[PDB]
Design an enzyme around this catalytic site. Structure first.
Site, PDB file in Angstrom:
ATOM      1  N   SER A 197       0.923  -1.127   0.115  1.00 17.94           N
ATOM      2  CA  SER A 197       0.065   0.095   0.147  1.00 17.94           C
ATOM      3  C   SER A 197       1.110   1.075  -0.007  1.00 17.94           C
ATOM      4  O   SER A 197       1.511   1.544  -0.859  1.00 17.94           O
ATOM      5  CB  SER A 197      -0.972  -0.017   1.156  1.00 17.94           C
ATOM      6  N   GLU A 324      -9.529  -4.663  -3.343  1.00 23.87           N
ATOM      7  CA  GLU A 324      -8.585  -3.542  -2.775  1.00 23.87           C
ATOM      8  C   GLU A 324      -9.522  -2.614  -2.007  1.00 23.87           C
ATOM      9  O   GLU A 324      -9.174  -1.812  -1.051  1.00 23.87           O
ATOM     10  CB  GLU A 324      -7.745  -2.849  -3.800  1.00 23.87           C
ATOM     11  N   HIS A 437      -7.413  -5.583   0.871  1.00 22.59           N
ATOM     12  CA  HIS A 437      -6.336  -5.039   0.998  1.00 22.59           C
ATOM     13  C   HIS A 437      -5.341  -5.291   2.161  1.00 22.59           C
ATOM     14  O   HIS A 437      -5.875  -5.225   3.206  1.00 22.59           O
ATOM     15  CB  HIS A 437      -6.583  -3.270   0.852  1.00 22.59           C
TER      16      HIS A 437
HETATM   17  C1  LIG Z   1     -11.168   9.227  10.217  1.00 28.45           C
HETATM   18  O1  LIG Z   1     -10.641   8.133  10.328  1.00 28.45           O
HETATM   19  C2  LIG Z   1     -10.673   7.178   9.135  1.00 28.45           C
HETATM   20  C3  LIG Z   1     -10.959   7.645   7.791  1.00 28.45           C
HETATM   21  C4  LIG Z   1     -10.931   6.675   6.840  1.00 28.45           C
HETATM   22  C5  LIG Z   1     -10.454   5.633   6.925  1.00 28.45           C
HETATM   23  C6  LIG Z   1     -10.025   5.119   8.204  1.00 28.45           C
HETATM   24  C7  LIG Z   1      -9.996   5.958   9.165  1.00 28.45           C
HETATM   25  C8  LIG Z   1      -9.373   3.802   7.888  1.00 28.45           C
HETATM   26  C9  LIG Z   1      -9.706   3.403   6.592  1.00 28.45           C
HETATM   27  C10 LIG Z   1      -9.226   2.305   6.181  1.00 28.45           C
HETATM   28  C11 LIG Z   1      -8.706   1.263   6.886  1.00 28.45           C
HETATM   29  C12 LIG Z   1      -7.653   0.750   5.677  1.00 28.45           C
HETATM   30  C13 LIG Z   1      -7.174  -0.361   5.835  1.00 28.45           C
HETATM   31  N1  LIG Z   1      -6.404  -0.460   7.090  1.00 28.45           N
HETATM   32  C14 LIG Z   1      -5.692  -1.626   7.591  1.00 28.45           C
HETATM   33  C15 LIG Z   1      -4.455  -1.704   6.723  1.00 28.45           C
HETATM   34  C16 LIG Z   1      -3.361  -1.074   7.079  1.00 28.45           C
HETATM   35  C17 LIG Z   1      -2.045  -1.141   6.387  1.00 28.45           C
HETATM   36  C18 LIG Z   1      -2.153  -1.861   5.580  1.00 28.45           C
HETATM   37  C19 LIG Z   1      -3.189  -2.770   5.123  1.00 28.45           C
HETATM   38  C20 LIG Z   1      -4.521  -2.521   5.700  1.00 28.45           C
HETATM   39  C21 LIG Z   1      -7.102  -0.131   8.300  1.00 28.45           C
HETATM   40  C22 LIG Z   1      -8.075   1.371   7.993  1.00 28.45           C
HETATM   41  C23 LIG Z   1     -10.266   4.526   5.926  1.00 28.45           C
HETATM   42  O2  LIG Z   1     -10.633   4.493   4.905  1.00 28.45           O
END
Ligand SMILES: COc1ccc2c(c1)C/C(=C\C1CCN(Cc3ccccc3)CC1)C2=O
Ligand SMILES: *[C@@H]1O[C@H](CO)[C@@H](O[C@@H]2O[C@H](CO)[C@@H](O[C@@H]3O[C@H](CO)[C@@H](O)[C@H](O[C@H]4O[C@H](CO)[C@@H](O)[C@H](O)[C@@H]4O)[C@@H]3O)[C@H](O)[C@H]2NC(C)=O)[C@H](O)[C@H]1NC(C)=O
Ligand SMILES: *[C@@H]1O[C@H](CO)[C@@H](O[C@@H]2O[C@H](CO)[C@@H](O[C@@H]3O[C@H](CO)[C@@H](O)[C@H](O[C@H]4O[C@H](CO)[C@@H](O)[C@H](O)[C@@H]4O)[C@@H]3O)[C@H](O)[C@H]2NC(C)=O)[C@H](O)[C@H]1NC(C)=O
Ligand SMILES: *[C@@H]1O[C@H](CO)[C@@H](O[C@@H]2O[C@H](CO)[C@@H](O[C@@H]3O[C@H](CO)[C@@H](O)[C@H](O[C@H]4O[C@H](CO)[C@@H](O)[C@H](O)[C@@H]4O)[C@@H]3O)[C@H](O)[C@H]2NC(C)=O)[C@H](O)[C@H]1NC(C)=O
Ligand SMILES: *[C@@H]1O[C@H](CO)[C@@H](O[C@@H]2O[C@H](CO)[C@@H](O[C@@H]3O[C@H](CO)[C@@H](O)[C@H](O[C@H]4O[C@H](CO)[C@@H](O)[C@H](O)[C@@H]4O)[C@@H]3O)[C@H](O)[C@H]2NC(C)=O)[C@H](O)[C@H]1NC(C)=O
Ligand SMILES: COc1ccc2c(c1)C/C(=C\C1CCN(Cc3ccccc3)CC1)C2=O
Ligand SMILES: *[C@@H]1O[C@H](CO[C@@H]2O[C@@H](C)[C@@H](O)[C@@H](O)[C@@H]2O)[C@@H](O)[C@H](O)[C@H]1NC(C)=O
Ligand SMILES: *[C@@H]1O[C@H](CO[C@@H]2O[C@@H](C)[C@@H](O)[C@@H](O)[C@@H]2O)[C@@H](O)[C@H](O)[C@H]1NC(C)=O
EC number: 3.1.1.7
Lengths: 532, 532
Positions: A197, A324, A437
């Site tokens: 990512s 994704e 993802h």
């Molecule tokens: C205001 O706080 C927010 C707003 C938007 C998002 C988030 C928090 C989190 C989010 C998406 C996921 C994306 C995947 N993340 C896990 C991950 C981390 C690192 C590599 C792969 C997946 C966790 C949060 C979001 O899209």
């Protein structure tokens, strides 16, 4: 001793660690920069002053100050991404896993964590290097870098908060690996940098950045590419965001120096609390403080660099996951939730569309909607859900990556492309999210080899085979064994555009990954938004 | 006598004609207007002054002055559309086929020929009414009307060349049928008007035109609809075309009266020779002198009329052929020819696209190309050929018709929709043209019933079944027999949008005819061309 290593910065003492009924050495928490604290907050990193004595490197260091996900307290699905150590501005450290006995000169792999440039940690269970170090006999490094405003606040023209400091953190750790990995038995001329990512986009950016290119040999990008529409902003947008961050904290905004001085007095959690307030649009898959196109780290626009061949020419291995977009719809878009199937109304669709393409006039929103709508069945809720998952995936991850790949491959020295579409059997997130993802990562770091974690036999096989592709590629520039009997991952070329699926079935080769949709996103839609 | 009929215009003598081992009466060449000759050229038609004596109606009349296709001299495929009698400005006649013995009050069908408004004839073999008259016991009328500049030159504001005179010819013949068909045994309150292509659009236009609506009861439209982008022009475009026609003939252009006087001195073939020179774009499926949106025949824009329900409310039966575009690509577009498979290069495609959508900026041409291109296989020559066939069909015939149908059906009293996709077994045109525009006609007029013409048994069955659908619909407003055991053609409704296939296989019902592409053409693309 096997666990004492003298380096150009000083001696460090590691620790022996068990792994799959055997043992390796780990050197955890080695500093590669000065603490970026006090008046150094927002500054370029400075190299770690060498130390006398033995640096205890038996335990993981602090994670950087970041947003912590609290949407599903106690749920492993979300918590497996959050910091598992205390957070601190004092966070520029790296970890090294070394086979035992110590090798003399072996292939080095350097992991750059994702997290949308607003979070992430080197210390997470799913980034534990030991299985991969041990199974493939590589030296596995994981670095850290400043995230959020600490890493990416950008007041271009100022030297106190220039932008890109988090990418310079990464660059310094790679300098340090270049300069010292020989002492741990790694070969500095065979350093592969790999990332997921934003980690993947970070990889791509070091490929493009002249100041980074000499520091590594080859590159793996997982679900991320330096041209993702979320992974950078102009200097005017950076500026706007930093002023607005200061507006949220009652800062004097009359000068760069007043504003920075004000931001430097705040406790870190004060900045984190208001970070999401500066985004200019109501949007998903957008993060506030990201890399800026500054003329320095990046000498011109990313597209002019990619077009003119202004980047490092080497081998790259790279790809995407089938689903994704799912994560970002869950967290950001109306109608998606963790415990329902999240069937979506026409009206949550249209809303979703507008969150997904925030820079877009109405004609653009219509063009997108048309591209993804089955008009014989426009009220199927499964289709609208899956339709939006694809829009988000395609626009943000798959088509930028496919555009990176095609541009890189005209000047580069060998490209290998994958599409990972195996859904882990033990995934705790719901089914509608599909191949989410970040869920190739566990296969890359070998976690299916551990019985306790409940993967299937076939998943252990897939992981071993992915570890070996990644490590063989790091070693040779090619993920295939020269004279194996196993089927061969072909080279992606300009004309034929081949790629493989990564899953539990016998290898299949296809061509032109999502080409129908990436022409929409890479050619037609930008033309449409330019003319209107 | 059975062949003497006294009408309000005078007596006429018909002729007995054999048909499928039996006989009926035919009254051929009956005048319904004054000869539109000399100073009457371009004028509204005037009613035929009644005559004393017996008008000999034993032979077909003259065809109107028109362009004659000479691309394939002697080839039946093309020559079956050309005038089969001498051409003359004296051409406003109709033909009537009447069962024998003479009925008292039977359903009347009135055929309006197609020909792009630049040609056509009532006298063609494939429009011979006798089989249909005889098989379904209808009185079958075929009218004629002025085509080309003779029918459609338009100098709005002038009374000498007002525009639409060819549609007024049709209206007068329908007045005449209204006023006299009772004497031949037809029922004037059960007149169905039916037409193909421009004949079909003509039908639709009499449905919309207030001055025409009272003259008939119901309507069948075959591959044509009054809103086709080729079937009308604005008054400014009409004007421009008529001035340019005069420019091509060295006319004084200072006034309407100078220009008209000049056009009236020319021999008809002089006008025909230069007619194609006035088109404003390099285009296919565009004809020079067509109906004008004048405020009189058509009181407002067609779309405002269709939207506000300003049209006749009745039953309509209507549909399209599978491969409507093929004819026009053959004649007009580079790379298509009669004796090859006409595989098309990327470059003949792009050229084709530009001929097909002539009003279109580059962004529009890209939107079209994208909609019809398989980017996994963009150099398949079969696909580019078929792709262009679809573009031409969809833009010009299928999607306007589908838009007509959906708008009409909100206010109308019953809609029946078909998709004809049987390729006649004896078709002399090549295979790549598929189910060609105009080749349902022979099935409608019953030609497969004649052994000599070499249709199959199953084709005779299809024709009988289509004749019966058409005649039963004309009779009742419904093509199905009330209590048949046969499968039922359902009603097209707003919500369900049902239609049937017409072919040799047992009836299938589907929904939403080409909806994916007609949303492109009816909603997205016009939005795109308005904003740019
Ligand atoms: C205001 O706080 C927010 C707003 C938007 C998002 C988030 C928090 C989190 C989010 C998406 C996921 C994306 C995947 N993340 C896990 C991950 C981390 C690192 C590599 C792969 C997946 C966790 C949060 C979001 O899209
Ligand atoms: C990654 O980079 C490596 C090295 O840069 C590259 O391998 C190179 O491939 C080229 C082929 O383009 C080799 O150049 C050849 O050299 C031999 C002698 O050494 C010559 O005989 C060849 O000339 C003949 O064939 C040519 C066709 O390419 C003709 O043009 C010519 O008229 C001759 O008949 C040719 O010049 C080069 O030797 C290697 N280099 C090494 C060290 O292997 C590799 O292809 C790149 N990988 C990818 C995937 O791009
Ligand atoms: C591999 O698979 C196995 C089998 O599916 C799995 O083992 C299970 O783990 C969970 C721990 O999450 C266990 O569930 C607990 O059981 C105890 C005792 O009966 C309960 O008291 C627990 O309830 C508490 O926690 C819940 C929420 O977390 C609350 O809802 C509740 O109020 C209580 O606070 C809890 O349900 C389950 O018993 C075991 N099963 C077995 C056979 O051991 C294992 O976790 C998987 N391994 C990995 C690494 O995932
Ligand atoms: C073509 O047009 C014809 C006639 O215009 C049309 O048939 C008509 O259908 C309507 C139904 O909307 C009929 O109206 C009904 O009349 C009866 C008594 O004659 C009433 O009992 C009905 O009222 C009851 O049911 C209604 C539901 O529509 C309720 O609203 C109401 O509360 C009552 O319970 C109703 O008013 C009308 O009689 C016929 N006309 C004739 C002469 O048949 C036909 O539907 C049209 N075809 C298409 C395809 O549109
Ligand atoms: C129903 O099917 C049958 C069988 O397929 C079909 O009968 C055929 O019609 C054509 C007439 O077009 C005949 O072909 C001609 O044969 C004569 C005598 O052998 C030739 O001299 C002819 O050649 C002249 O015309 C050609 C071009 O039109 C020129 O190329 C050449 O120079 C000559 O000028 C011509 O080939 C064929 O012989 C008959 N077959 C039979 C078995 O009778 C019939 O036409 C079909 N019916 C309908 C209505 O279509
Ligand atoms: C300058 O002369 C031209 C230009 C263009 C075309 C033509 C002539 C002919 C043409 C198309 C075909 C369309 C189908 N026509 C047969 C037909 C007539 C009436 C109803 C159905 C089919 C024959 C000509 C054209 O597109
Ligand atoms: C090295 O450190 C090990 C673990 O350190 C832990 O964290 C630090 C900050 C201390 O507070 C320590 O007590 C914690 O356990 C020790 O177990 C180990 O003995 C140390 N070895 C040396 C030589 O210092
Ligand atoms: C009616 O007409 C029949 C055919 O007419 C043909 O065309 C006209 C213009 C004449 O030139 C004619 O000689 C042609 O044969 C005749 O066969 C028929 O006898 C005519 N009947 C009457 C009563 O006039």
């Amino acid at each position: 001793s096997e666990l004492l290593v003298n380096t150009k910065s000083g001696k460090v003492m590691g620790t022996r660690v068990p792994v799959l009924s055997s043992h390796i050495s780990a050197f955890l928490g080695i500093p590669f920069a000065e603490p970026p604290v006090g008046n150094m907050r927002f500054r370029r990193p400075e190299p770690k002053k060498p130390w006398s004595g033995v640096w205890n490197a038996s335990t993981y260091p602090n994670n950087c100050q970041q947003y912590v996900d609290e949407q599903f307290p106690g749920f492993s699905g979300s918590e497996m991404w959050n910091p598992n150590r205390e957070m601190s501005e004092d966070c520029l450290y790296l970890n090294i896993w070394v086979p035992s006995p110590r090798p003399k000169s072996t292939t080095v792999m350097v992991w750059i964590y994702g997290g949308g440039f607003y979070s992430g940690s080197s210390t997470l269970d799913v980034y534990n290097g030991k299985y991969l170090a041990y199974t493939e006999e590589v030296v596995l490094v994981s670095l850290s870098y400043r995230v959020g405003a600490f890493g990416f606040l950008a007041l271009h023209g100022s030297q106190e908060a220039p932008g890109n400091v988090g990418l310079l953190d990464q660059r310094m750790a790679l300098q340090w690996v270049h300069d010292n990995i020989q002492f741990f038995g790694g070969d500095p001329k065979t350093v592969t940098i790999f990332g997921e990512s934003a980690g993947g986009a970070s990889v791509g950016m070091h490929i493009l950045s002249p100041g980074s290119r000499d520091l590594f040999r080859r590159a793996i990008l997982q679900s991320g590419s330096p041209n993702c529409p979320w992974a950078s902003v102009s200097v005017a947008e950076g500026r706007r965001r930093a002023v607005e961050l200061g507006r949220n904290l009652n800062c004097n905004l009359n000068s760069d120096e007043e504003l920075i001085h004000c931001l430097r007095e705040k406790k870190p959690q004060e900045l984190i609390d208001v970070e999401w307030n500066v985004l200019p649009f109501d949007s998903i898959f957008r993060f506030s403080f990201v890399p800026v196109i500054d003329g320095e780290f990046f000498p011109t626009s990313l597209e002019s660099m990619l077009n003119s061949g202004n980047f490092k020419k080497t081998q790259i291995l790279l790809g995407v996951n089938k689903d994704e977009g799912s994560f970002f719809l869950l967290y950001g878009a109306p109608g998606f939730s963790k415990d329902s199937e999240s069937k979506i109304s026409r009206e949550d669709f249209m809303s979703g569309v507008k969150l997904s393409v925030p820079h877009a006039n109405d004609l653009g929103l219509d063009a997108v909607t048309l591209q993804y709508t089955d008009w014989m069945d426009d009220n199927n809720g499964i289709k609208n859900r899956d339709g939006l998952d694809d829009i988000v995936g395609d626009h943000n991850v798959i088509c930028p990556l496919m555009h990176f790949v095609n541009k890189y491959t005209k000047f580069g020295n060998g490209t290998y492309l994958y599409f990972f579409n195996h859904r882990a059997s033990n995934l705790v997130w719901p089914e509608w999210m599909g191949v989410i993802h970040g869920y190739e990562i566990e296969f890359v770091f070998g976690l299916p080899l551990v019985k306790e974690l409940n993967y299937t036999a076939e998943e252990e096989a897939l992981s071993r085979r992915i570890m070996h592709y990644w490590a063989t590629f790091a070693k040779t520039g090619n993920p295939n064994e020269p004279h194996s009997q196993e089927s061969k991952w072909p080279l992606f070329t300009t004309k034929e555009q081949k790629f493989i699926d990564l899953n539990t079935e016998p290898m299949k080769v296809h061509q032109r990954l999502r080409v129908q949709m990436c022409v929409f996103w890479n050619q037609f839609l930008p033309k449409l938004l330019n003319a209107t």
